[PDB]
């Protein structure tokens, strides 16, 4: 009763957590993605919402540089315009749910500059491989 | 498998103070919580002292007779479990053993057992 | 707090015999009671867990039974290996106590 069983972080553990202890475990919020004549088709139509919102994540996680990696570095730089936060900070003070509020604005441009960045590394690894 | 390999026994004199280390492999170390257990030299158990995992609560636990006075700590990222001693008495001169505990509801047990290191408090 | 009193402190059993060893708490711990084996110059070693279960590693000579605060370790049939120091241990409330042990001798 003294509770001293090992209690593994569940899902959504560090959800209030900085970045810095959120980013420990993201695989659990990743596997939770997929597993977990009327009323058959409200169960249809929810493993076919289910299946194109993870498709189109993984689409554009795959049309990165990122095939299943699920943590990678990129080559852009940071713009000071889209955050102006210090950096000390931003791995201890601030909070993911704090985040996505905080560069809203920002993405879409982002995502406009991943593929740009990306396809333009493809390219370079084709004229790399095109000469030998 | 679980090892765990403690580290640092000694002849004390009483009111003296020492650190115990165990360090341990085969599990997730940060996600156990860990114990120190002494055996008397008439061979009785004592606990001693207790320090949660990450996802326990991660609080320290020692019984009445050494509260105040025992201090238990844990090192995760090395994997490596640390007993600080002060104020030390000659009762607690025992063979301390490291202990690793089970999972969930049915892990508050003592699952796995160091080999032990020897105070001598005279 | 909970003490933990482990009967009898001594027993000399034949090898192939069975035993059973009890242990009394001094409150409820509903199930939180759980056996371990000490060789001679060796560490303890998990036997039972949780007044009992069974663990990985164990010979299945070891079972487990009881409830509240009486609770009991058999053997069913000893080997020259089991022949030890036997504690009981409790998790229903700190501090963690012990039982006395018993001295299994050959």
């Known amino acids: 009763a003294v509770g001293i069983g090992a209690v593994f972080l569940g899902f959504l553990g560090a959800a209030g957590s900085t970045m810095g202890a959120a980013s420990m475990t993201l695989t659990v919020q990743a596997r939770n993605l997929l597993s977990g004549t009327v009323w058959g088709i409200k169960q249809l139509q929810a493993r076919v919402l289910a299946v194109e919102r993870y498709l189109r994540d993984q689409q554009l996680l795959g049309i990165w540089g990122c095939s299943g990696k699920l943590i990678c570095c990129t080559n852009v730089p940071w713009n000071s315009s889209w955050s102006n936060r210090n950096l000390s900070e931003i791995w201890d003070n601030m909070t993911w749910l704090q985040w996505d509020k905080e560069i809203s604005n920002y993405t879409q441009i982002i995502y406009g500059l991943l593929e740009e960045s990306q396809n333009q590394q493809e390219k370079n690894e084709q004229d790399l491989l095109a000469l030998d | 498998e679980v090892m765990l390999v403690e580290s640092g026994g000694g002849l004390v004199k009483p009111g003296g103070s020492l650190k115990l280390s165990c360090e341990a492999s085969?599990?997730?170390?940060?996600?156990?919580?860990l114990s120190w257990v002494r055996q008397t030299p008439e061979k009785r158990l004592e606990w001693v002292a207790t320090i949660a995992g990450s996802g326990v609560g991660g609080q320290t636990y020692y019984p009445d007779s050494v509260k105040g006075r025992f201090t238990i700590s844990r090192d995760n990222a090395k994997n490596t479990l640390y007993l600080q001693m002060s104020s030390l008495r000659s009762e607690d001169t025992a063979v301390f053993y490291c202990?690793?505990?089970?999972?969930?509801?049915?892990?508050?047990?003592?699952?796995?057992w160091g080999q032990g290191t020897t105070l001598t408090v005279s | 707090d909970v003490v933990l009193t482990q009967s009898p402190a001594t027993l000399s059993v034949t090898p192939g015999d069975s035993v059973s060893l009890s242990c009394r708490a001094s409150?409820?711990?509903?199930?939180?009671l759980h056996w371990y084996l000490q060789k001679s110059h060796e560490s303890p070693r998990l036997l039972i867990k949780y007044s009992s279960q069974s663990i990985s590693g164990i010979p299945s000579r070891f079972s487990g039974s009881g409830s509240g605060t009486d609770f009991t370790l058999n053997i069913n049939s000893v080997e020259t290996e089991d022949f030890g120091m036997y504690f009981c241990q409790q998790t229903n409330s700190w501090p963690l106590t012990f039982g006395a042990g018993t001295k299994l001798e050959l």
């Open positions: 409150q409820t711990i509903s199930d939180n």
């Open positions: 085969g599990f997730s170390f940060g996600f156990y919580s």
């Open positions: 202990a690793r505990h089970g999972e969930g509801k049915y892990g508050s047990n003592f699952a796995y």
